[PDB]
Amino acid sequence: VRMNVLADALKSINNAEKRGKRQVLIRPCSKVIVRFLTVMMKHGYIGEFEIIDDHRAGKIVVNLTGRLNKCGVISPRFDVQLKDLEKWQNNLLPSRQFGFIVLTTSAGIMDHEEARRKHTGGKILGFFF
C-alpha cells in the first residue's frame, strides 16, 4: 500500500522530465507535496502547478520546463543537527554551489539555504537540482 505520497509525486515528476514530458498529473497530493512543489517553483526547477479538487485527496498538474536533472525524496525523514546539514548537501548535491536539500523544520518546510539563514534545523524531506 502507501507509506508515503511525496515519494510518488517526486518519482512521477522525474519520469515525466526523463521522457521529455512538459506536464504531469500527480495523485494524490498533500500539504507537504504542495510545500515541496512550491520550494521547487520558487527556484525555477518547475513551472506553474495546479491543484485540482476531486472530492477526495487532490490531484496536481505540474508544468515543467527542463532545468530539472533530479528531484529525490529521502526516507526515512532523518533528524539533522545543523552540522549534519553540511554532511547531507555534500552527500547528495552536484556542486557545493547549487542544488538544494529541502528539509522540514519547526519553522517551515524549507531549502537548506533558507535553513542556514534562519538558523533552524530539523528532519530531511528530499532534494533537487
Partner 1 sequence: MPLAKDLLHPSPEEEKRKHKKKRLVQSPNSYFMDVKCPGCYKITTVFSHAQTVVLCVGCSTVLCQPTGGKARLTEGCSFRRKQH
Partner 2 sequence: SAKIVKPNGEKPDEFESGISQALLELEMNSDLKAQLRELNITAAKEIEVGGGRKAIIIFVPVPQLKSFQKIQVRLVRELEKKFSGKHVVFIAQRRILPKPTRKSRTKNKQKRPRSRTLTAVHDAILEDLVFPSEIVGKRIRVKLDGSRLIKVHLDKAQQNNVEHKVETFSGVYKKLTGKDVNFEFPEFQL
Partner RNA sequence: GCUGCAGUUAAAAAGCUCGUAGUUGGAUCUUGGAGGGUGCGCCGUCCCCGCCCUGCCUCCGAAGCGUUUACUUUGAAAAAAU
Q: Does 107 bind partner 2 (CB under 8 A)?
A: no
50: contact with partner 2 by CB under 8 A: yes
Query: How far is CA 34 from its chain centroid?
Result: 9
- Between CA 104 and CA 17 the distance in angstroms is 25
Q: Pick from RNA, partner 2, partner 1, none: which does 37 bind, CB < 5 to 8 A by kind?
A: partner 2
The nearer residue to partner 2, 48 or 84, going by C-beta atoms, is 48
When asked if residue 2 is in the footprint of partner 1 (CB under 8 A), the reply is no
Positions in the binding site for RNA (CB under 7 A): 1-5, 28-32, 56-58, 76, 79-82, 91, 105-106, 114, 116-123
For the bound state, the minimum distance from the C-beta of residue 117 to partner 2, rounded and expressed in Å, comes to 17
**Distance between CA 72 and CA 51 in Å, rounded?**
21
> Given candidates 1, 2, 3, 20, which one binds partner 1 under the rule CB under 8 A?
20
Residue found by looking up cell 505520497 in the block:
5
23's contact among partner 2, RNA, partner 1, none, with CB below 5 to 8 A by partner kind, is partner 1
The string of DSSP letters for 64-107 reads --S--S---B-SS--B--SSSHHHHHHHH-SBTTB-EEEEEETT
Q: What is the DSSP letter of 7?
A: H
Taking a C-beta distance cutoff of 8 angstroms, is the pair 24, 8 a contact?
no
Q: Which residues bind partner 1 (CB under 8 A)?
A: 19-25, 50, 52-56, 59, 61
